[PDB]
Design a protein around this ligand. Structure first.
Ligand SMILES: Nc1nc2c(ncn2[C@H]2C[C@H](O)[C@@H](COP(=O)(O)OP(=O)(O)OP(=O)(O)O)O2)c(=O)[nH]1
Ligand SMILES: [Ca+2]
Ligand SMILES: [Ca+2]
Ligand SMILES: [Ca+2]
Length: 343
DNA sequence: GGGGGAAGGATTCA
DNA sequence: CACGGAATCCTTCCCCC
């Protein structure tokens, strides 16, 4: 009953840069996000394995990477490029199933149930998909196969990189008991911790705790999710998913609270955001700010009609005004987010 | 009491 | 010193029948 095949491209941004400049293949490559603030201020979008080996990875400051690997190749993130390559591969996967859910810029779940019997065939289809993607785009990915999206995903995690793996029903039962609950999708450090205090260290433990306390501790939705898995009864279908919001945010040269100093950044964000909107019309706008102490403050508003760029400019100004008046810290970054698209 | 929303923020993942 | 971006969930305050 139902066979899910999850595809996860390998160290995606770095690998795409390798493909576009093979002279890179073989040496450590780090894709970065730089912000004027200073010489090498920014974070690491990601890096290839010939770099992950020494700890350089997503989230750490570019400077830190530089110390560890001073002579590695540091590339500016070219999101737009990775996107179009992503779209191409996404098309290429449709050829294998109508039921396709695009999770992110490099993730996708395929429902190959009414498409192929047993696991032995699932596997092959896997290898087939890899080859095709590999030959067509020269991009290696990892394929996870199991009874649902959750374990399909976990599968790939286990099989990374450029791998493939199937978690059979017998194994599922083993992981519901042996797999560290932390390693379960949707469980970050915050929840992980919350779970330990409650004694829960495995997906199974959830079955030995009174709901209401669990629900009370991690929220009902997270509780039902986990319990669901533990009972080997999880079964969310693979559905299409359209964007629900679009935004842009930029880090300023220096901190500030001066409206007239921030406004320019904010307006660049809006202009950029509208271009990205294309033909979509938003009913809601939020102004998101990152404070000096790396905290995130936001203020929004929904209109009974769509928002025009003019409308956005003036309304974004008030929300920034509101933020300032309601939060004493200097603002480090400023952005906008449009949502609730008409239709 | 409880439905229907909006707003501000928490948590997670890429 | 820690960047862009986006979804989902949760708490809370409201209006109101
Ligand atoms: N800007 C930014 N982008 C990120 C971050 N994390 C991931 N990404 C982007 C670039 C990654 O290549 C892409 C896929 O993330 P994964 O979590 O799949 O990492 P990646 O595919 O690079 O390596 P992998 O082989 O999956 O371990 O998402 C992040 O922290 N900041
Ligand atoms: Ca990946
Ligand atoms: Ca991914
Ligand atoms: Ca985890």
């Amino acid at each position: 009953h139902m066979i899910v095949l999850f595809v996860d491209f390998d160290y995606f941004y770095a690998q795409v840069e390798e493909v576009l400049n093979p002279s890179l293949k073989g040496k450590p490559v780090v894709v970065c996000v730089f912000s004027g603030r200073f010489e090498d201020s920014g974070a690491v979008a990601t890096a290839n394995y010939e770099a992950r080996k020494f700890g350089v990875k997503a989230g750490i400051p570019i400077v830190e990477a530089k110390k560890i690997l001073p002579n590695a190749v540091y590339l500016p993130m070219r999101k737009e490029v990775y996107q179009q390559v992503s779209s191409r591969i996404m098309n290429l996967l449709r050829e294998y199933s109508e039921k396709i859910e695009i999770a992110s810029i490099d993730e996708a779940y395929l429902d190959i149930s009414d498409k192929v019997r047993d696991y032995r065939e699932a596997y092959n289809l896997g290898l087939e998909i890899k080859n095709k993607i590999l030959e067509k785009e020269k991009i290696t990915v990892t394929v996870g196969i199991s009874k649902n999206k959750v374990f399909a995903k976990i599968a790939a995690d286990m099989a990374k990189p450029n791998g493939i793996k199937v978690i059979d029903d017998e194994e599922v039962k083993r992981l519901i008991r042996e797999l560290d609950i932390a390693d379960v999708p949707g469980i970050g450090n915050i929840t992980a911790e919350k779970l330990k205090k409650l004694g829960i260290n495995k997906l199974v433990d959830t079955l030995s705790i009174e709901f209401d306390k669990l629900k009370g501790m991690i929220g009902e939705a997270k509780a039902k999710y986990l319990i669901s898995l533990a009972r080997d009864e999880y079964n969310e279908p693979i559905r299409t998913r359209v964007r629900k919001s679009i935004g842009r945010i930029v880090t300023m040269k220096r901190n500030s609270r001066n409206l007239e100093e921030i406004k320019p950044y904010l307006f660049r964000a809006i202009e950029e955001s509208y271009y990205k909107l294309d033909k979509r019309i938003p009913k809601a706008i939020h102004v998101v700010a990152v404070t000096e102490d790396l905290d995130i403050v936001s203020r929004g508003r929904t209109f009974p009609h769509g928002i025009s760029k003019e409308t956005a400019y003036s309304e974004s100004v008030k929300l920034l005004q509101k933020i300032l008046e309601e939060d004493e810290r200097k603002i480090r970054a400023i952005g906008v987010r449009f949502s609730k698209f008409i239709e």
